[PDB]
Amino acid sequence: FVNQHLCGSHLVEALYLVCGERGXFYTPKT
Amino acid sequence: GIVEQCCTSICSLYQLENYCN
Secondary structure (H helix, E strand, O other): OOOOOOOHHHHHHHHHHHHOOOOOOOOOOO | OHHHHHHHOOOOHHHHHHHHO
16 A cells, blocks of 8 residues: 545555445445 | 545554444
8 A cells, every 4th residue: 555645446445455344234224 | 424435534554444343
């Protein structure tokens, strides 16, 4: 990683990559 | 929210990981 501002698709992929998990499961909670 | 916080200021992987919870 390297420090940067992040938006939209760049942001949602960057938090998915560090987490290793998709979210948004059957009957969404968020 | 997360979209404002990380697009108006820097978010490292150490910040982004908190928002997966």
